[PDB]
Amino acid sequence: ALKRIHKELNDLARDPPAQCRAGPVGDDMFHWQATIMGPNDSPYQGGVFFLTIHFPTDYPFKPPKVAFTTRIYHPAINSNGSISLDILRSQWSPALTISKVLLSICSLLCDPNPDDPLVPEIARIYKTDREKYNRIAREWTQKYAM
Amino acid sequence: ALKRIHKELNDLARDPPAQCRAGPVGDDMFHWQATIMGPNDSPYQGGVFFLTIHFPTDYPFKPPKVAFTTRIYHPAINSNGSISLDILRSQWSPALTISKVLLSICSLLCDPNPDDPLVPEIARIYKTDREKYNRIAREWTQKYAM
Amino acid sequence: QLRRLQEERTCKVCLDRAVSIVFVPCGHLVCAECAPGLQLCPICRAPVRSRVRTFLS
Amino acid sequence: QLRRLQEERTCKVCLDRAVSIVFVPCGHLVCAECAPGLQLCPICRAPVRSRVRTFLS
Amino acid sequence: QIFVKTLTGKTITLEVEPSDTIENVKAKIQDKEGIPPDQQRLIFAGKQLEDGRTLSDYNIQKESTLHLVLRLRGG
Amino acid sequence: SMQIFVKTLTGKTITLEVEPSDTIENVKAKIQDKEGIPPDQQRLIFAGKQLEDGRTLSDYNIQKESTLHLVLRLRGG
Ligand SMILES: [Zn+2]
Ligand SMILES: [Zn+2]
Ligand SMILES: [Zn+2]
Ligand SMILES: [Zn+2]
């Protein structure tokens, strides 16, 4: 795992992605901090969001554990910051990288998945009243992410 | 065929094997002359043998025509210089190069295959009296290959 | 332009070794060290119905 | 030395185009232009049961 | 001439008009990379590109950079 | 041990680690795992002579740095 993580890290330095940053905190290559900018044209625009990333000792044959540390209003992300995303469990591919995982995450922010959401009350709102959902999502962004 | 033949010729310039040389006679890239050194500690030792090579226009999907110019004593080569080698007919492969073909022919010299001889009388001598076969081979090398 | 080549042959799972193993039917490749655990192509998700060791010389 | 990698991927029949087609079972590769004219593998002579297009990705 | 960053980070150069849809593009990516269009999720900025819209509808300019990732799902 | 070179059919040169007492079959097996050519399709040549399966490198007096040539199995006729 260590070589593969170093390679990803080297690639990140060689081609930094826009809106996303990730890398080790300390000397521990297996625990990373990451940030994501709120995508433009969504309720999270202008917000900054922090995540923690823990790589398993058999990475990349198992997915990294990824979680938000910033409060965010979204059907797939609960108050422990856990994310409901298939590529992080069953649909993980060993060819995925943190760069791509973070991007998948941004993608989820703009377009929530209606199937089997983590925070049903939010999904319920998103399903019925969108003005409500968007409003609260922005307020949450204004409050916690800026 | 022409490109393929040019690329072959270059690889000869770059990394020729030790016992053979070959190349276009004229400006005609489809008609080549070759040289094979007689293998050491064999009856053909000290010998230099010339061959003629003609590439078909569909080379390398069809074998080249190869024949000895220099007279030689061997059950697989007749007095017309014709060589009985399966890779020159139905065992040909399009990955074989003239370089490999010449090396193939050279290995016949010290390893005549008595099975299906082109010149049965010569094989008969090789089978019964090997002392004799060597003498005649050496003598022939002496007249012709010097 | 050499980076184009050395990285075209690099296994995209381990990001380290050269590819050797081809997955059929999809046709993607991985290195021999990464291949055995993989039932689905890491690149396209195609089921790997068989894998083939390649010799590129 | 880019030449070296360049030689690696070169079809060994035409000595020209890059290899894209793998023969199975044997795992030898040729370019798409040479493939259709090969019943047997030019490298090892193994019969060609099928031809798979490879993708580097 | 546009640019696509594949699942593995290889940058491919495409050729298309603004007229070409997001579905049309996935086919060229398939032709090039051997990846079924249904396994393809393409991303402009931080947002997904759906099947119906166009390269012009998302405001993709000359030499604009797109990102391919794997198909996603789940809540 | 010691190392020898084999010029493979396609022309690439590969390096092998060998014992001077290794049989020709031994070497054809190493070639097979490297190049994917079964031993019965291999004909190994050194100093213009074919190397026979049941013999060793020492019998052909093959030394460090020797360059062996690989061609396809061929039938005398
Ligand atoms: Zn690998
Ligand atoms: Zn695949
Ligand atoms: Zn070819
Ligand atoms: Zn083969």
Report whether B49 contacts B85 (CB < 8 A): no
In Å, the largest CA–CA distance within chain D is 35
Which two tokens mark E61?
Answer: 């300019």
Q: Is F53 on the interface with C (CB under 8 A)?
A: no
Beta strand A48-54 with A31-37 is antiparallel
User: Between the CA atoms of B53, B58, B63 and B68, what dihedral angle is there, to the nearest 10 degrees?
Assistant: -10
Report whether C26 contacts C39 (CB < 8 A): no
Whichever domain contains F68, its CATH number is 3.10.20.90
Q: Which of A19, E8, F22 is nearest to C7 (CA)?
A: E8
Mark out the alpha helices in C7-57 (DSSP H runs).
Answer: none
CATH entry, D1-57, from 3.20.20.100, 2.120.10.30, 3.30.40.10, 3.30.70.3040? 3.30.40.10
Which two tokens mark A38?
Answer: 């709120």
Q: Where are the domains of chain D?
A: 1-57
Report whether A54 contacts E60 (CB < 8 A): no
Interface test with E, best of A104, A116, A124 (most E CBs within 10 A): A104
F12 vs F16: CA distance, rounded Å: 13
Q: Which amino acid is at B27?
A: D
Domain of residue F44 covers 1-77
Which two tokens mark E60?
Answer: 């993709």
Which two tokens mark F21?
Answer: 């007492």
**Residue B146 in 3-state DSSP?**
coil
Instruction: Give residue F16 CA to ligand 1 midpoint distance, Å.
Output: 24
Q: Where are the domains of chain A?
A: 1-146
DSSP secondary structure letters along B8-54: HHHHHHHS--SSEEEEESSS-TTEEEEEEEPPTTSTTTT-EEEEEEE
Which two tokens mark D29?
Answer: 């590769």
Give resolution in angstroms.
2.2
CB pair distance less than 8 Å for D53 and E10:
no
How many domains does chain E fold into? Answer: 1
Q: Which amino acid is at A24?
A: P
Instruction: Give the architecture (CATH level 2) of B1-146.
Output: Roll (3.10)
Touching subunits of D (3+ CB pairs, under 8 Å) are: B, C, E, F
D30 vs B3: CA distance, rounded Å: 17
B87 vs F37: CA distance, rounded Å: 17
Residues 6+ apart with CB under 8 A from A127: A114
For residue C17, what are the CA distances in angstroms to A5, C6, C45? 15, 10, 21
F28 vs F55: CA distance, rounded Å: 12
